Ligand binder design. Structure first.
Ligand SMILES: *[C@@H]1O[C@H](CO)[C@@H](O[C@@H]2O[C@H](CO)[C@@H](O[C@@H]3O[C@H](CO[C@H]4O[C@H](CO)[C@@H](O)[C@H](O[C@H]5O[C@H](CO)[C@@H](O)[C@H](O)[C@@H]5O[C@H]5O[C@H](CO)[C@@H](O)[C@H](O)[C@@H]5O)[C@@H]4O)[C@@H](O)[C@H](O[C@H]4O[C@H](CO)[C@@H](O)[C@H](O)[C@@H]4O[C@H]4O[C@H](CO)[C@@H](O)[C@H](O)[C@@H]4O)[C@@H]3O)[C@H](O)[C@H]2NC(C)=O)[C@H](O)[C@H]1NC(C)=O
Ligand SMILES: CN1C(=O)N(c2c(Cl)cccc2Cl)Cc2cnc(NC[C@H](O)c3ccccc3)nc21
Ligand SMILES: [Ca+2]
Ligand SMILES: [Cl-]
Ligand SMILES: [K+]
Ligand code: NA
Ligand SMILES: [Zn+2]
Length: 806
């Protein structure tokens, strides 16, 4: 109950909310049906509209007016935004030349430049160029401030997950808002866009920016705006808050616009009807900047213009129906649309089996427009698994398509022409970022970056210490004039051992064989030097990775490659090698086809054994440094060492072999040499973090050899490709992947064909940031370069998306 009997007099858009039965006057009261009786009359005034006119200039204050054109309005902080323009001969902000803002130019009493977040729903990245003619205020922000060509949203590219990621720096799996619709089995409760349950605090994890600010003594305007409050009123309210006295005035504010998303759904991303919503957003930005200029705040405030996600063309006729695949369709619940999530309709149904559902949905139709996954098999870059609110069965839907349970759901519930929600690497899902103000750089373009990074920057902008989050703090330092965050590299936790020759061949009873007993101080001094690390400068270009946890491991040197060998996991944590543009691919010679050699630096007790692979009918093995790329026939023997061997399903070997035999050379040829670091990943609990030994669910039969869930590679070269990878003077270029180590190739519908027709497509889908690999391995890469650490952090957050140009 709300006794709506109090008054909103002098309380309009109060910043501190009152607890019922006292009625509310805050910008959310409408949503709780809890506004005081006079809320509309006092707080949502509209009389005379939103602009001053020549005849209103110098008028006597009439409190009924929506905004004011009287002489007292400026000090009252409630002029119409165009007051000075109409009445005092000022120019609109958009008509002023831009001028570098080198320092905050704030009124006396401001302790820090305020931050205003101007968030626009569904604002696709390509609108900045394609709509430039009709958005002059936004274009001035973009060209004069710091801008990216686009900003990557999180998956799913829905509104609530992305806005909350913007506010927290967290992946949806960590903040808990994993969709616009959700069921939490622990609460036994549902979350929807419409309704009340979404207001319950138990849905919202992490620590959003307004809470971070409050806790550290920085006041925040309220971020949420009732849909019925018009945009002009939201702007005027922010401007009024900015005129509060020093002790009450917030330092952080957000505006939100439901456009252009609202019209995009109806008309498609580029419908002719889309021009007007873009013009209207621009006019709103103009109102804010004119209003800031009137208050002498236009060179004081940092403004961020940011979207949540883009918008794609999607129509009813592009719907796949699960009823065309499943006989048991009524035994499931589907969260439908641009992603699919499946669970059992009833938990008392013992016959329900996710394995058979997956199988009935796998590669059934020639041009099938969705692909089923167990959530832990989704591309790791999506970070979409470690939350009980994410169903075990997921469908990744092709851009432009929907999935639904049955046709009745689509025709009994074509209206829409646009939607969003798809894979966050999809170009149409990309959104915008512009930062403008004293703390941002002047006339600067920065590379595309992920929205998880912004929370750290907004904290930097407000002098706040960010709560723990998924951004990489410092990776966006290049956006900022000042207030940069200068992190130190993490300390190595475990130092390596450097074993020499300590074991005789006959101490090994591994069931391994090799035809190598075919034997000179010219080349024996030479090979000892290589085993001591004489070529390590060539193969370890950026220093050895640091191990950031407690473990026991050995560095192993070889002519063609260097590795950090784990005595706990019985395999390398990493293997590093450089392949020059000129390098030649050779074959595994016939006499070495099944060769595995004991490594006399590493005890039998810390080695794999060939017998376990022989006995394990499902499990085979591969090599981290590929024999195909050996520098010479003699160096090739090194690649067959038991310490270079890793467990691989035969199905996965098809992928790995094509990567090593064909793709590495191709990249070296295209990029003028590459350095590669490859290794295993163990993530059995799908939390995106390195497993401890006690978390491993699968071993090679009869052995303590743990089976990786994934294999990574990090492929680094010179950004200036006219310089060879091993002789690079400036910035680096990287692409990486985290390939799922799967016993079948069911994920690839064309895998019966030659690897040249399906492997690269699989690898593109499993593209990764180095930072993702760091989380998954507890390793820290690029420790020894000539580059600034912030630049290296930016490199580590880079994702090679393989999408064409926006
Ligand atoms: C991205 O960034 C984020 C933020 O840094 C990273 O997430 C963190 O990962 C940490 C390491 O796993 C994790 O640390 C754990 O914290 C537990 C206490 O957590 C509570 O308190 C914090 C602080 O206020 C709070 O943030 C948490 O909020 C979570 O939980 C609620 C759900 O009830 C949600 O509202 C919220 O959204 C968030 O959920 C997310 O995280 C949890 C895990 O905490 C997931 O399960 C959810 O699915 C969701 O993703 C909590 O309120 C603490 O209990 C843990 O300690 C256990 O394990 C350690 C192992 O080292 C051990 O030392 C302890 O003794 C303890 O073990 C005991 O409990 C075990 C489990 O019950 C049991 O098995 C044992 O036998 C023992 O009895 C642990 O320290 C941290 O909470 C999250 N933080 C957040 C915000 O998510 C994330 O890793 C980053 N991602 C990537 C890819 O890098
Ligand atoms: C997303 N969103 C909605 O979907 N709304 C809605 C609509 Cl339009 C129709 C039906 C039901 C609902 Cl709930 C109303 C709404 C109101 N205010 C906001 N503010 C977002 C805030 O500024 C912010 C938060 C995090 C980071 C940057 C900015 N977001 C809303
Ligand atoms: Ca893990
Ligand atoms: Cl959803
Ligand atoms: K085998
Ligand atoms: Na297949
Ligand atoms: Zn939408």
């Amino acid at each position: 109950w709300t006794a709506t009997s109090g008054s909103c007099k002098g309380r309009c858009f109060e910043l501190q909310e009152v607890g019922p039965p006292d009625c509310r006057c805050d910008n959310l009261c409408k949503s709780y049906s809890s506004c005081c009786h006079d809320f509309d009359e006092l707080c949502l005034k509209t009389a005379r509209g939103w602009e001053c006119t020549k005849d209103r200039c110098g008028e006597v204050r009439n409190e009924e007016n929506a905004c004011h054109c009287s002489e007292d309005c400026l000090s009252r902080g409630d002029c119409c935004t165009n007051y000075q323009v109409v009445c005092k001969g000022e120019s609109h902000w958009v008509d002023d030349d831009c001028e570098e803002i080198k320092v905050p130019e704030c009124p006396a009493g401001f302790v820090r430049p305020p931050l205003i977040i101007f968030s626009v729903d569904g604002f696709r990245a390509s609108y900045m160029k394609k709509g430039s003619k009709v958005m002059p205020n936004i274009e001035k922000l973009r060209s004069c401030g710091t801008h990216a060509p686009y900003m990557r949203p999180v998956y799913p590219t829905k509104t609530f997950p992305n806005l909350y990621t913007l506010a927290t720096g967290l992946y949806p799996e960590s903040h808990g808002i994993v969709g616009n619709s959700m069921y939490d089995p622990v609460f036994d409760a549902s979350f929807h866009l419409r309704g009340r349950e979404k207001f319950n605090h138990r849905w919202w994890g992490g620590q959003p920016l307004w809470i971070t600010a409050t806790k550290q003594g920085v006041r925040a305007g309220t971020f949420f705006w009732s849909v019925s409050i018009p945009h002009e009123r939201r702007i005027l309210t922010i401007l009024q808050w900015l005129s509060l006295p020093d002790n009450e005035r917030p330092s952080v504010y957000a505006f939100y616009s439901e456009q252009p998303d609202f019209s995009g759904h109806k008309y498609g991303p580029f419908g002719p009807e889309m021009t007007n919503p873009l013009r209207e957003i621009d006019k709103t930005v103009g109102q804010l900047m004119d209003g800031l200029k009137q208050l002498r705040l236009h060179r004081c405030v940092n403004v961020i213009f940011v979207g949540d996600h883009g918008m794609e063309d999607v129509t009813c006729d592009r719907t796949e129906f699960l009823s065309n695949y499943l006989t048991n369709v009524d035994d499931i619940t589907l969260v439908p649309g641009t992603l699919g999530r499946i669970r059992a309709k009833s938990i008392n149904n013992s016959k329900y089996d996710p394995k058979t559902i997956i199988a009935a949905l796998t590669c059934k139709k020639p041009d099938q427009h969705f692909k089923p996954y167990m959530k832990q098999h989704l591309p790791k870059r999506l970070h979409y698994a470690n939350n009980r609110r994410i169903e075990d069965i997921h469908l990744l839907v092709d851009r432009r398509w929907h999935v639904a349970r049955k046709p009745l759901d689509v025709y009994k519930k074509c209206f829409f022409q646009g939607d969003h929600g798809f894979d966050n690497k999809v170009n149409s899902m990309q959104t915008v970022f512009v930062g403008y103000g004293p703390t941002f750089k002047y006339r600067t373009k920065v590379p595309p970056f992920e929205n998880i990074e912004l929370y750290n920057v907004m904290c930097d902008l407000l002098g706040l210490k960010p709560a723990p989050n998924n951004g990489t703090h410092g990776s966006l330092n290049h956006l900022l004039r000042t207030n940069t965050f200068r992190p130190t590299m993490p300390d190595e936790v475990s130092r390596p051992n450097y074993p020499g020759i300590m074991y005789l061949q006959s101490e090994f009873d591994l069931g391994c064989t090799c035809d190598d007993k075919v034997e000179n101080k010219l080349e024996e001094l030479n090979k000892r030097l290589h085993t001591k690390g004489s070529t390590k400068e060539r193969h370890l270009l950026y220093g050895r990775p640091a191990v950031l946890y407690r473990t026991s491991y050995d560095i192993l040197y070889h002519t063609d490659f260097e590795s950090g060998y784990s005595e706990i996991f019985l395999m390398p944590l990493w293997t590093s090698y450089t392949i020059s543009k000129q390098a030649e691919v050779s074959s595994i010679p016939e006499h070495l086809t099944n060769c595995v050699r004991p490594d006399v630096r590493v005890s039998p007790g810390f080695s794999q054994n060939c017998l376990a692979y022989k006995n394990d009918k499902q499990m085979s093995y591969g090599f981290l440094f590929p024999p195909y790329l050996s520098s010479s026939p003699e160096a090739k023997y090194d690649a067959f060492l038991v310490t270079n061997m890793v467990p691989m399903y035969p199905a996965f070997k098809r992928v790995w072999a094509y990567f090593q035999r064909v793709l590495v050379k191709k990249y070296a040829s295209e990029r003028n040499g590459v350095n590669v670091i490859s290794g295993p990943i163990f993530d059995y609990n799908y939390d995106g973090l390195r497993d401890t030994e006690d978390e491993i669910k699968q071993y090679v039969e009869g052995s303590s050899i743990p089976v990786p869930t994934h294999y990574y590679s990090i492929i680094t070269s010179c950004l200036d490709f006219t310089q060879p990878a091993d002789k690079c003077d400036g910035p680096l270029s990287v692409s990486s992947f985290i390939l799922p180590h799967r016993p079948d190739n069911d994920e690839s519908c064309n895998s019966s064909e030659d690897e040249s027709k399906w492997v690269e497509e699989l690898m593109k889908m499993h593209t990764a940031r180095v930072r993702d690999i760091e989380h998954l391995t507890g390793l820290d890469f690029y420790r020894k370069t000539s580059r600034s650490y912030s630049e290296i952090l930016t490199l580590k957050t880079y994702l090679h998306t393989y999408e064409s140009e926006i």
